[PDB]
């Protein structure tokens, strides 16, 4: 281009893969509005959900 | 890196860039991420194209 070298990177995609990640007992996941207070070292949540995957 | 502690990661992170060493002053020094967050959510069935 314009009598100088020109480099083009082309990338295309038509493939997506769905995954599932799980932990096992005695481990669980707490999902929601999780608040961490570093001064009092407290973790608090209202209406979180317990999940595995 | 804050009052909750410092977390570091020694695994590599990949990006596109130009060497720019031994080049003229027109060589861009910015690094480019080829894919963004919307490439994993928006238009899953639609074909995606990236040109650099």
């Amino acid at each position, epitope marked *: 281009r314009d009598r100088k070298p020109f480099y083009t990177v082309d990338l295309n995609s038509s493939l997506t893969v769905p995954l599932q990640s799980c932990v096992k007992p005695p481990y669980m996941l707490v999902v929601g509005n999780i608040v961490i207070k570093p001064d009092s070292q407290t973790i608090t949540c209202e209406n979180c959900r317990l999940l595995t995957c | 890196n804050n009052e909750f502690g410092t977390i570091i990661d020694w695994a590599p992170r990949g990006q596109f860039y130009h060497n720019c060493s*031994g080049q003229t002053q027109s060589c861009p020094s910015a690094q480019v991420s080829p894919a963004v967050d919307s490439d994993l959510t928006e238009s899953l069935d639609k074909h995606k194209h990236k040109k650099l």
Partner: antibody
Amino acid sequence: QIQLVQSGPELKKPGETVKISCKASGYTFTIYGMNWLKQAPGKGLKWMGWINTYTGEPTYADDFKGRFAFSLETSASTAYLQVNNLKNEDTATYFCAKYYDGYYGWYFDVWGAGTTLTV
Amino acid sequence: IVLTQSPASLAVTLGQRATISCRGSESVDSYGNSFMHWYQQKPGQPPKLLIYRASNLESGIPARFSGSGSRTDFTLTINPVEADDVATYYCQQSYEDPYTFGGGTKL
């Protein structure tokens, strides 16, 4: 068109200093660096270095690091080459040239008119 | 990187091919481009670039001039030699600081 006009010939003596002007006309001065080239009569060309017209940072070759200074005037689109404590080995023509940009673009298509120097 | 350009002086008559050979101590090929350049300098004048990147004819140069060259080996060709080609030709290297020029070749 792009034209690099240099200063006229000058006469000097050892121990003094010389200021050389090279005004660029026909392109944005801040996007293109300025190169300085030296040619002793009867011999080949030698590359001295270049000045970053976007930041002002000067660079010099391994055989020209000693007593050379690159400066520029952005407002008037002019670059100055300064030689201090002239010696008898400095009798040469000095060229200002615009490189051809791009990948490994250290080759020159537009040259200055020239500036003969004797000391 | 040092460059050796041969012959030091070439004597060719009008209407005959002229060939100049330039070598290098190291390769100058990078990412599909060979960075060897040919200049022409007439006395009292700045050099004018003839062939850039070893194969490309500069704009405004007459079609008589043509360049060619492989890795570390490059050549310049002038088939229809005229009387205005009397000058010195240099092979230049633009791949490494200080981007050294050539010694010269009289013709």
